[PDB]
């Protein structure tokens, strides 16, 4: 049989339900969302890391001429200079009365440390959510893991179970992101082929070990200015360390709902938000006919004591009369309250307690023992402790915090002035007629 139900997106929050079929005892169904797995689609754009300038041996043409030539190396620079003043420990490298000239050039390349200090700029889209569900029926536990989509049931025992789509779409990830040393940072990285000195991603490459590179970081050559042969180079500070210094806090400290983000899939997990509708198919053989089910008689409830606690602290008791030994389930069709155990033994005239929780102080509701129903009411008090991180609000508040006494007082407050005005008008018209008599 197939049953439909909506569940909150949250871990460690079992949800209990029942299936009604004529001649079959209502079957307890427990559903647990073990964890969440939001995996988006992303594409590798480029990589960046601290670079190193190249300072190759300059070219010296003595007492003659020469011309500059470009080079395919990324961020390359070249420039000639006449009237050079070459000196070295060995002395004047060559000789002519200041006629000689020298060509200098430089370029950049990623340093060896980059191999492990690389930071990759990622473009992401189409967040996809994966949900793992564990379902208990007839004290039998089955499992499945399915994409949140409502069109691809998973495989578990060759059982087709579907979930979603989500009520709302949530994704902490933004279109542009960066990954560095296992830390993910939300930032609008410059597009590939865009070089801006003193900025993130100044050096860009298709792959870490790509021979072809493109970069621009405003390198300007300086004229020789000293005795010896030297190439003074002026360049802006590397942008990688710049972004490192003031990169801001990591996404791990900014993700809403406490998403637990992992890097190797670049995906979130254990993050709770939204609702999920699901349809569960259960084999008919799993069901049990009511003929063999225990029969109960003259059952009653009693709230020994309840507390309006965030955690599961509510208690209840039931007393029953029966004729057959065995087990029956227990349920509460009121969403405001949730039980703890689904089934229990049954004796001829036994009475058993129950643990439960509620989201309202007016503990009035209907609970079913085995197949039969029964009303049960009480009032609960706020707790002394008022800060706890354990599961809370298994059912969200439904403006039911208002008390029965509050309803009685509000009813006694509003007055029936409409009846007063109606009676006044009626007597007024009657008197008007009586005086039209004259």
Ligand X SMILES: *[C@@H]1O[C@H](CO)[C@@H](O)[C@H](O)[C@H]1NC(C)=O
**Which residues are at the interface with a second copy (CB under 8 A)?**
41, 43, 123, 125-126, 146-147, 149, 151-155, 190-194, 214, 216
The string of DSSP codes covering 300-335 is EEE----B--SSS-EEEEEEEEESS-EEEEEEE--T
147 binds, among ligand X, a second copy, none (CB under 5 to 8 A by kind): a second copy
Is the Cα dihedral 316, 317, 322, 328 positive or negative? positive
139 binds, among a second copy, ligand X, none (CB under 5 to 8 A by kind): ligand X
Cβ atoms of 273 and 259 within 8 Å: the answer is no
Report which of 338, 358, 300, 265 is spatially closest to residue 38, judged by C-alpha positions: 265
Q: Which of 14, 138, 350, 391 binds ligand X (CB under 6 A)?
A: 138
CB of 329 to ligand X, least distance (A): 9
Judged by CB, which is closer to ligand X: 41, or 139?
139
326 binds, among ligand X, a second copy, none (CB under 5 to 8 A by kind): ligand X
CB of 173 to a second copy, least distance (A): 14
Judged by CB, which is closer to a second copy: 41, or 335?
41
Report which of 377, 279, 371 is spatially closest to residue 334, judged by C-alpha positions: 377
The SS3 call for residue 106 is strand
What is the x/- site pattern for ligand X, positions 298-327, by CB under 6 A?
A: ----------------------------xx
43 binds, among ligand X, a second copy, none (CB under 5 to 8 A by kind): a second copy
Q: Does 150 bind ligand X (CB under 6 A)?
A: no
Length of the chain counted residue by residue: 438
Judged by CB, which is closer to ligand X: 221, or 354?
354
Judged by CB, which is closer to a second copy: 74, or 307?
74
194 binds, among ligand X, a second copy, none (CB under 5 to 8 A by kind): a second copy
Judged by CB, which is closer to a second copy: 32, or 42?
42
Which whole-number Å values give the CA distances from 266 to 145, 257, 399, 428, in the listed order? 19, 17, 40, 80
Judged by CB, which is closer to ligand X: 139, or 335?
139
- The whole-angstrom separation of Cα 344 and Cα 348 is 13
| Exposure class string for 198-218: b at 16+ Cβ within 10 A, else e | ebbbbbbbeeeeeeebbbbbe
Residues making contact with ligand X (CB under 6 A): 138-139, 326-327
């Amino acid at each position: 049989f197939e049953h439909a139900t909506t569940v909150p997106n949250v871990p460690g929050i079992p949800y209990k339900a029942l299936v009604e079929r004529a001649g079959y005892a209502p079957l307890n169904l427990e559903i647990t969302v073990v964890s969440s797995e939001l995996t988006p689609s992303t594409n590798k754009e480029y990589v960046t890391c601290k670079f190193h300038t190249v300072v190759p041996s300059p070219q010296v043409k003595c007492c003659g001429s020469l011309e500059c030539k470009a080079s395919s190396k990324a961020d390359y620079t070249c420039r000639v200079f006449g009237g050079v003043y070459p000196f070295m420990w060995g002395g004047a490298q060559c000789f002519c009365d200041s006629e000689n000239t020298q060509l200098s050039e430089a370029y950049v390349e990623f340093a060896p440390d980059c191999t492990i200090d690389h930071a990759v700029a990622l473009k992401v889209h189409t967040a996809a959510l994966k949900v793992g569900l564990r379902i208990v029926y007839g004290n039998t536990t089955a499992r499945l893991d399915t994409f949140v989509n409502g069109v691809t049931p998973g495989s578990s025992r060759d059982l087709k179970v579907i979930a979603g789509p989500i009520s709302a779409a949530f994704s902490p990830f933004d279109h542009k992101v960066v990954i560095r040393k296992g830390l993910v940072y939300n930032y609008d990285f410059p597009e590939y082929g865009a070089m801006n000195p003193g900025a993130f991603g100044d050096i860009q490459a298709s792959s870490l070990d790509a021979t072809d590179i493109v970069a621009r970081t405003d390198i300007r050559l300086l004229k020789p200015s000293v005795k010896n042969i030297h190439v003074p180079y002026t360049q802006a500070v590397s942008g990688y360390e710049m972004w490192k210094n003031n990169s801001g806090r990591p996404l791990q400290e900014t993700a809403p709902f406490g998403c637990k983000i992992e890097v190797e899939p670049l995906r979130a997990t254990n993050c709770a938000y939204g609702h999920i509708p699901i349809s569960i198919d259960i084999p008919d053989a799993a069901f049990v006919r009511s003929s063999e089910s225990p029969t109960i008689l003259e059952v009653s409830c009693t709230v020994a004591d309840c507390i309006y606690s965030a955690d599961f602290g509510g208690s209840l008791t039931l007393q029953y009369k029966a004729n057959r030994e065995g087990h029956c389930p227990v349920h509460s069709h009121s969403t405001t309250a949730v039980l703890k155990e689904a089934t229990t033994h049954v004796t001829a005239t036994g009475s058993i307690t129950l643990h439960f929780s509620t989201s309202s102080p007016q503990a009035n509701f209907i609970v079913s023992l085995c197949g039969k129903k029964t009303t049960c009411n009480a009032e609960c008090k706020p707790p002394a402790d008022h800060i706890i991180g354990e599961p809370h609000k298994v059912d969200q508040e439904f403006q039911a915090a208002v008390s029965k006494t509050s309803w009685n007082w509000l009813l006694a407050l509003f007055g029936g002035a409409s009846s007063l005005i109606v009676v006044g008008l009626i007597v007024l018209v009657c008197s008007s007629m009586l005086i039209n008599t004259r």
